[PDB]
Curated annotation (Swiss-Prot), chain A:
Subunit structure: Binds to host ACE2. RBD also interacts with the N-linked glycan on 'Asn-90' of ACE2. Cleavage of S generates a polybasic C-terminal sequence on S1 that binds to host Neuropilin-1 (NRP1) and Neuropilin-2 (NRP2) receptors. Interacts with host integrin alpha-5/beta-1 (ITGA5:ITGB1) and with ACE2 in complex with integrin alpha-5/beta-1 (ITGA5:ITGB1). May interact via cytoplasmic c-terminus with M protein. May interact (via N-terminus) with host bilirubin and biliverdin, thereby preventing antibody binding to the SARS-CoV-2 spike NTD via an allosteric mechanism.
Disordered: annotated segments: 9-44
Function in brief: Attaches the virion to the cell membrane by interacting with host receptor, initiating the infection. The major receptor is host ACE2. When S2/S2' has been cleaved, binding to the receptor triggers direct fusion at the cell membrane. When S2/S2' has not been cleaved, binding to the receptor results in internalization of the virus by endocytosis using host TFRC and GRM2 and leading to fusion of the virion membrane with the host endosomal membrane. Alternatively, may use NRP1/NRP2 and integrin as entry receptors.
Species: Severe acute respiratory syndrome coronavirus 2
Effect ascribed to mutating residue 40 to V: In strain: Omicron/BA.4, Omicron/BA.5, Omicron/BQ.1.1
Effect of residue 38 to A: In strain: Omicron/BA.1, Omicron/BA.2, Omicron/BA.2.12.1, Omicron/BA.2.75, Omicron/BA.4, Omicron/BA.5, Omicron/BQ.1.1, Omicron/XBB.1.5, Omicron/EG.5.1
Protein name per the record: Spike protein S1
Effect on the protein of changing residue 7 to F: Decreased HLA binding to NF9 epitope. Increased binding affinity to human ACE2
Mutation effect (residue 37 to A): Increased resistance to neutralizing antibodies
Impact upon substituting residue 6 to R: Increased resistance to neutralizing antibodies. Decreases HLA binding to NF9 epitope. Increased binding affinity to human ACE2
Domain of life: Viruses
Effect of substituting residue 47 to R: In strain: Omicron/BA.1, Omicron/BA.2, Omicron/BA.2.12.1
Result when mutating residue 44 to S: In strain: Lambda/C.37, Omicron/BQ.1.1, Omicron/XBB.1.5, Omicron/EG.5.1
Region described as Receptor-binding motif: 1-50
Length: 50, 62
């Protein structure tokens, strides 16, 4: 399994044309603040292809 | 680093449309010390940059 290729799974809004987003900010999917710590409802915005 | 380039009154216009950064420029000599003089001139385009970078703030440097 090659996991070097990634895709963004979460984002507050859709991209405008030709926009490039390389940010790694932790996405808070719930009501609990993440404070930069990944976990339940606190996800790394990127995920690897299998 | 996706890009790098190396080469009175000055007027510039900055817009960001579809990830393209348009910079229009113009220059002219002046003699005034209060504010920008009254008059009219046109600012031709000088740079189009394919940044594709989000913009919500800027800051000058002097
Ligand atoms: C560019 O980044 C700005 C952040 O500065 C985005 O604007 C934010 O959008 C969220 C969406 O919920 C708001 O909660 C913030 O208040 C906004 N902040 C500002 C300063 O406007 C903007 O959507 C981004 N745009 C693109 C195309 O990436």
């Amino acid at each position: 399994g090659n996991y070097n290729y990634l895709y963004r799974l979460f984002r507050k809004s859709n991209l405008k044309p030709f926009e490039r987003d390389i940010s790694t900010e932790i996405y808070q999917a719930g009501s609990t603040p993440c404070n930069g710590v990944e976990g339940f409802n606190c996800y790394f915005p990127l995920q690897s292809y299998g | 680093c996706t890009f790098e380039y190396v080469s009175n009154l000055r007027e510039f216009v900055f817009k960001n449309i579809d990830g393209y950064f348009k910079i229009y420029s113009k220059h002219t000599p002046i003699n005034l010390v209060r504010d920008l003089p009254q008059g009219f001139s046109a600012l031709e385009p000088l740079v189009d940059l394919p940044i594709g970078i989000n913009i919500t703030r800027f800051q000058t440097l002097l």
